Amino acid sequence: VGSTDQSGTPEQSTPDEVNAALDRLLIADALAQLSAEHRAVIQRSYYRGWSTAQIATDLGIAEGTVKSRLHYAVRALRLTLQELGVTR
Amino acid sequence: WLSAASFQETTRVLTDAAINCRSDKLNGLKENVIIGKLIPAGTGINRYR
Amino acid sequence: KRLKVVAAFQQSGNSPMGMVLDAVPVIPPELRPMVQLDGGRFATSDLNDLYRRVINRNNRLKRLIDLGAPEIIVNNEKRMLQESVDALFDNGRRGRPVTGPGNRPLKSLSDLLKGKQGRFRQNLLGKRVDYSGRSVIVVGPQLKLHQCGLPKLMALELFKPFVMKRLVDLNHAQNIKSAKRMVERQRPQVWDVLEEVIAEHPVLLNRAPTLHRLGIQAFEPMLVEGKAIQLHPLVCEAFNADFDGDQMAVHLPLSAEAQAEARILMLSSNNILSPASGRPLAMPRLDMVTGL
Amino acid sequence: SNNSVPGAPNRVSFAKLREPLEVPGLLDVQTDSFEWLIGSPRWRESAAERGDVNPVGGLEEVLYELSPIEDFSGSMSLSFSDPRFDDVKAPVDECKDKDMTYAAPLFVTAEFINNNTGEIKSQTVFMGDFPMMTEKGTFIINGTERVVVSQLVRSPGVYFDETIDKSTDKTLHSVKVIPSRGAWLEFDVDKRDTVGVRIDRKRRQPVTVLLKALGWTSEQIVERFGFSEIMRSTLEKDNTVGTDEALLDIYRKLRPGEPPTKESAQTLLENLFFKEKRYDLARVGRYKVNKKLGLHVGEPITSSTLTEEDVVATIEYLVRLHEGQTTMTVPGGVEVPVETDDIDHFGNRRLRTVGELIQNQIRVGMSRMERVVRERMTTQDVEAITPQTLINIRPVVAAIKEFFGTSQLSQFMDQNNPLSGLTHKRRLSALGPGGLSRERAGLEVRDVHPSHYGRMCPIETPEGPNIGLIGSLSVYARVNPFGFIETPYRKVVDGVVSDEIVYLTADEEDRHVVAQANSPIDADGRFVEPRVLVRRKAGEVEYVPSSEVDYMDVSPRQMVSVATAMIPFLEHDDANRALMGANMQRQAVPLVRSEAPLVGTGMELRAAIDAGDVVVAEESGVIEEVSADYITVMHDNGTRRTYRMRKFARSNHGTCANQCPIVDAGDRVEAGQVIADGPCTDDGEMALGKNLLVAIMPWEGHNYEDAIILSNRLVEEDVLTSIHIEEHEIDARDTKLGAEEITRDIPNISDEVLADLDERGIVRIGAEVRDGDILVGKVTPKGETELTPEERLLRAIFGEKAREVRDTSLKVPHGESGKVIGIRVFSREDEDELPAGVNELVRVYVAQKRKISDGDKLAGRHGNKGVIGKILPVEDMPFLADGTPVDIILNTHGVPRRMNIGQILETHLGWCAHSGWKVDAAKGVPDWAARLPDELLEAQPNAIVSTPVFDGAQEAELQGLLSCTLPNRDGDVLVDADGKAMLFDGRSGEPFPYPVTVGYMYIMKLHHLVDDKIHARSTGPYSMITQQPLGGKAQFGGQRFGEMECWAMQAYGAAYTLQELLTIKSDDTVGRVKVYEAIVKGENIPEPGIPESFKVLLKELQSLCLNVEVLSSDGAAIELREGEDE
Amino acid sequence: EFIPRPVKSSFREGLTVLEYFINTHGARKGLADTALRTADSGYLTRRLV
Amino acid sequence: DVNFFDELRIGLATAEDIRQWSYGEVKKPETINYRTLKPEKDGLFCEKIFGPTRDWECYCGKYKRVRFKGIICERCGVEVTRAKVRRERMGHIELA
DNA sequence: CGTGTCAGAGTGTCACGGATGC
DNA sequence: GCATCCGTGAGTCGAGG
RNA sequence: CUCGA
Ligand SMILES: [Mg+2]
Ligand SMILES: [Zn+2]
């Protein structure tokens, strides 16, 4: 039906990364205020996307130890974000 | 060949460019504009830069 | 003239055999994108119809070679493969071009580089830029020669990241995230903050066509109400700008060097004389000369 | 009085010349062309009195040409007859609402003729839903009013050219035979004194190669062309001889690659030029040949085909012109001159209107179906065939759909104001298919031709790249069934003006001489002077005896367009600013309330009525009931007709089309009288603006070269306030992971933003909405595998599960704001036909009330344009002696350059209209008012007047009116006999040192408002391929720092600004994000990287088998975030 | 070339119908070539650049 | 990726260079599937050749998570990186 | 899938230089 | 050896389809 | 296609 070179076809656009850049800045701020154990566990589950047992094998710790650290480190960030007015 | 291909006769310049295998020293106003370097003029010359 | 071609192949060490291709490269897909339409159907770049025709005729030739088809079909097929690669690289160069639906010539790969719509002139010598706007220009006699009046709504969006910075400094906003929502919603705090931001931060004014370098001049912005740009009456000669519906563009220099180039090199007060002749341009011209 | 025919307001005209013929129907061009196409009774009755015998409509004309369809044997035949229409499928406004097409089903009578069976089955066959033309002269395709524009094309015929050679500097000659359809044929004499012929743009063969193939012996050729030595050199230099030899020579150059048979070339050389299948000169094309060559000039037009006799007479016509001959008679033909044709003359340039442009599309669509018929005959049996089985209407309706859907002639209707719409229907466009390319239109097609007098306007034309290529039809002009434009004239017998009026075509006008309209004429009809200014062929103006005048112009304004004829004192404005004056009247914006101008031309009444945006009474009667919604009229016979008002409807261009009743309860209204008027109408007259108190003086530089100063009274009293309506739209589709749903529940949004929404997620009627407010709450399900690492962490640190949907709500664009006035919802659930894949569709109408702002573009009727430079408080404005402040301050410097004194003359007459006047009747009528009508000797305040174009008020009478202007309520005369008045500086109090011209001028608000034309962008969307910011305001894009603008930077030496513009501010993927972070962090601006656009350039040079590599200072190639595999 | 008959009226007086018509011939071709003369101008400019 | 590099060299592209660039041959003439929007294998949009439509999402659907970064899927042949490669990975047609 | 009359495109630029060609 | 013919170029910016 | 400087 259509050809992009032909007129009358809308060109593709991609939105700006402003909202993503600001969140990444705030996430990087709240990350520094974490213990070296907690920061090195959320960055292996959400930034590296590993499994619960994969992080346990790397850090040389127990299975439930990774579960407990992630459970708090998430709430620790929610504390730091809500104290700065980050919208729920 | 980069300053010429953006002026006129794009194919005629690009054909003779690959045959003679010309290499372009990126030192010129029109060239640095394309690649994003400071133009070698005004506040871009090495004296003031 | 023959030696010019022959001597080049000898010294360089590249074989002339490259002029004959055994394989043709395919440009990555995002440079020939196929977009879906709001009617359900699709629309693809012409390069996809050219690459498809080369593939169609090249695969049919592979069948004829396997089948041992008569030399008349194989030779007449090989000819069409040559015309296909010729159309993919420069459709229309030899003979009549490959028409698409509606007798429109398809755009080949070499069409992406030629002329005003080509890659060089359209997307390399000139680009669209962030931190810029445009509106109608209106004469403002009260402005000083180094000043210009731009609308408040224009400045807020133009200086949006700078306003967001100060909104979190003065604690009008909790975080930078909510500071962005304040500018999009135009909370009353931004208008007091916006004035602090544009303080002695020069802006660039331009009117097409940009005939000489004074077609772009730097000014000190002053927040004015309304939606029109207020231009000084003396720079009208340089811009060749009358006030019968003209529009001008505004560009905001960000880096320290860019502001310094606007403050010193491009400021309207530092460019009263014409660089072509040396005679002044920002001088009494119409009502001003009659009044004097 | 002016226009005492419909019952309109009494505008008093400064008319010294009587009007012999009243203005025709301004919509006839669109109306008459379509009535002929569908064979309406009105067209048939018009043709009956025209003298026609058995006339045939455009649809019938296509069916008769089509009939009959037969195979190679002749055993099967199909025929069509009696085309008829059923009632319209849906009313006009219903199609605008539901976005369908206004059409009526077309029925025809078809029958199958079988010679071998002796019986025929005839029945009614439905052909297709046929797009119908509204009474306003428009079509409605998918709910948008469109206008089929009349096209100026090269008329069919034989045309001769006198070209001058480049290298040998000898006068050459060429011929073109342009058929109404089929193959072309052009003969020419080159610089070697030889004659040749190109056939269908193929290679140029010697002219005798064609003559030998048609059966002409080499001897009979020498007998016919022997008187010239250039033809004796042609048969000798000829290559091949023989009837069966040059016939194959033509075959191998025309259809190469095919076996040449003596009977395969004998077949096509007859079918391509002499069989009505693949060749046809129209009834106008045949007629244009039979006059140019001087043959068959008496025979009734029956041959719809080129003949062999014409080809010889054409070559005979050419060779004589080459050697200086001026006269030729074809053997057995009348005498005719030998000359070259203009092709710009309106007798050789043809106008094809709506009916023909649609007829040609129907003809092409029928031919595609015809091939389906012949194919379906030889496949199916010859005994179960009915007309329904042979007919596949798919290629027919798809041919009319493709035309109205996509065509340079099917144009989105101009709907700024009624005048813009009326002008759009009367446009004549050279561009389009069959005409010319914009890149091939030279400076000769575009300029004014002397044959355009009274046919196409010499003023009204755009000043952009389409100058000259688009014109407007003159007022009294009309089109004959051939395609040429006729203009009326009064036949002068022997220096005696007669009331007999006859329409002459362009070439018919040259065979006589016509007197200018403003000729001094006796009450009996005899010219006062023996020598009178008269127009002659080839654009010659000279005096000539009174016994030589054959005709004379109907009205002075006969040569101008309708919009051009609306500029008072047009004869005092140069053509440059006059063009802008008419072009900007079509750009006026319909205001909240409308006032008719004090200074008029008389055309304002008919322009509004004929445009079709008012409400005229069809039949005489009394007003039974009147409301803001509808008007009911009780007729004399007893029937009732009710007219519904169009209230606050969005036009094509966002202007407010709003009709208002004029009559009251129990008013006797005559037939054809305005009972209600719409946008830009006041009591039935074009009210494109307002009457403003103007002072002509510089004022503190706020009106510096064409800027305008306005009194804030125009803001406080909504004088220049206009309503604008925008349409916003969004739909709910089916996605891969679910379905988009329109719902009030939107993730992570407060109850405060959603407060203006109803329970469905739609904004409620009446709610005022700024930019960014939600109009329709739509959420689309997004997959889990599409989540940012930070977004998945941010989702975990907020504990919000089940939010697999993201926000895709319809929000208000930047720069929009107003009240929500209407909502329309379309749901697949509720039988509403949506495109496949959609479940719901919502349209929200937002109306803004736009007061006049700083920078909004105002203009008058004389090409005096300008933006609002300053809106002073009412006290700051310079005010008159009685405290009344002026409304608008126009700079003096922008008056004597433009040569548009009409604004000064209007300002004078405008004041006299505002105040009124009384001429001294005692001691007789003064010597300046002797020519004025008696109705003008006394005027009341706020009187309305007409200054017809090229007639109207003279400076002798205008000077005399300023001397007797009526005093105000206090008894004081404010303006002097010069027209100037004493003003007071409202800012200081001191009176202005000199008197200033003060009066009333009609000012229009043009559709160039800052509310639309302001735009700015920090960041936003980027074009996916080039990674540069989008373009245009609607896409929230950035400005283009073009090629010329980069030279300015380099001329300054501003290197960092130049690098900054092209990198971090544009297409640097990482630099732009890091700059935004560096600003919100307060850090410094980082270092610019490499443009992604340059990365694409290299990847594109690679696709052309060019090995481009980037080398470092040492010489090693460096990659750009990529490798290479095999 | 100039028309052998001049426009004797002034714009203050008021041109006749034929006087106005012959004037438009030069006015329209004045605007018409102004678009072409700027094209060859802007082309000569970018060549000089 | 610094912005100081002296020369920009151009030359004829050997038919052996074209294969050195290409991440696979475009065999079939098909484009995508007009229901699933998934590109057909060895077509003009093949993910095995040019790259994945979505980031870290393969064709066969086995690898959709980020933890398998850099794995060449065995069932569909697609690598698992970001869709940024689909702007720079070249293909080629082998002519008969 | 198998296939057995034949039905057939756009047309108003031009200046200028140099390789192309009888 | 030269007339022919091919290929090159022909302002910038903005708004709505 | 249509218009604005
Ligand atoms: Mg202007
Ligand atoms: Zn896979």
Supply φ then ψ for residue D77, to 5 degrees: -150, 145
User: Binding site annotation covers C244?
Assistant: yes
β-pairing verdict for D708-711 and D888-890: antiparallel
- Angle, alpha carbons D793-D799-D802 (nearest 5°): 100
D600 closest CA partner among D682, D679, D678: D682
- Tell me if there are at least 3 CB pairs under 8 Å linking chains D and B: yes
Report CB contact under 8 Å: C121, B11. Answer: no
Q: Straight-line distance from CA D284 to C1' G9, in Å? A: 25
Distances (CA, A) of D527 to D495, D508, D519, D531, D952: 6, 23, 7, 9, 21
Provide the 8-state DSSP code for D747: T
- Locate E17 and state its tokens: 């119908």
Task: Give, as ranges, the nucleotides of chain I with any atom within 7 Å of a protein CB.
Answer: 1-5
Question: By what technique were these coordinates determined?
Answer: X-ray
Report CB contact under 8 Å: A9, C104. Answer: no
| Residue D1042 CB in 7 A reach of strand I | no
Residue D712 near residue D872, CB atoms below 8 Å: yes
C261 Rama class: left (phi>0) / alpha (psi -120 to 50) / beta: alpha
Exposure of D414 in the CB half-sphere (CA atoms within 13 A): 21
- Listed in sequence order, the residues at least 6 apart from D593 whose beta carbon sits closer than 8 Å to its beta carbon are D718
User: Binding site annotation covers C66?
Assistant: no
Rounded CA gap, D904 and D573, in Å? 10
Residue C34 near residue C42, CB atoms below 8 Å: yes
Rounded CA gap, D458 and E21, in Å? 7
- Listed in sequence order, the residues at least 6 apart from D953 whose beta carbon sits closer than 8 Å to its beta carbon are D14, D569, D905, D909, D945, D947
How many CB atoms within 10 Å of residue D170? 11
- Listed in sequence order, the residues at least 6 apart from B47 whose beta carbon sits closer than 8 Å to its beta carbon are none
Report CB contact under 8 Å: A12, C100. Answer: no
* Residue F64 Cα to ligand 2 middle (Å): 8
Q: Straight-line distance from CA D375 to C1' G4, in Å? A: 15
Report CB contact under 8 Å: C25, F89. Answer: no
Residues in chain A closer than 8 A to F66 (CB atoms): 48-49
How many CB atoms within 10 Å of residue F9? 17
User: Which helix or strand (DSSP H or E) is residue D176 part of?
Assistant: strand D171-178
Rounded CA gap, D197 and F85, in Å? 58
Rounded CA gap, D808 and D474, in Å? 52
Sequence letter at residue D396: V
Pick the residue from chain C with its C-alpha nearest to D1075. Answer: C254
* Alpha helix positions (H), D814-923: 902-915
Report CB contact under 8 Å: D1077, A21. Answer: yes
Q: Would you tell me which residues 49-68 of chain C have a C-beta closer than 8 angstroms to some C-beta of chain A?
A: 49
Pick the residue from chain F with its C-alpha nearest to D1108. Answer: F10
Residue C121 near residue C114, CB atoms below 8 Å: no
β-pairing verdict for C147-151 and C216-224: parallel
* Alpha helix positions (H), D1063-1111: 1069-1080, 1092-1102
Residue C201 near residue C186, CB atoms below 8 Å: no
Rounded CA gap, D837 and E12, in Å? 67
Query: Is the Cα dihedral C133, C137, C143, C145 positive or negative?
Result: positive
Counted across chains B and F, CB pairs separated by less than 8 A come out at 33
Residue C249 near residue D1039, CB atoms below 8 Å: yes
* Residue A47 Cα to ligand 2 middle (Å): 22
- Locate F31 and state its tokens: 């484009």
Q: Is C269 helix (H, G, I), strand (E, B) or coil?
A: helix
Is A20 in CB contact (< 8 Å) with chain D? yes
D598 closest CA partner among D306, D282, D852, D940: D940
Rounded CA gap, C279 and C273, in Å? 5
- Locate D133 and state its tokens: 């033309």
Rounded CA gap, D47 and D36, in Å? 9
User: Binding site annotation covers C287?
Assistant: no
How many CB atoms within 10 Å of residue D777? 26
How many CB atoms within 10 Å of residue D808? 16
Place of tokens 């034989």: D158
Report how far Cα D213 is from the mean position of its chain's Cα atoms: 47
Q: Straight-line distance from CA D371 to C1' G4, in Å? A: 19
Is B21 in CB contact (< 8 Å) with chain C? yes
- Tell me the sheet residues that pair with F91: C26
Q: Rg of chain A over CA atoms, in angstroms?
A: 20
- Listed in sequence order, the residues at least 6 apart from D512 whose beta carbon sits closer than 8 Å to its beta carbon are D504, D550, D551
Residues in chain C closer than 8 A to D1031 (CB atoms): 128
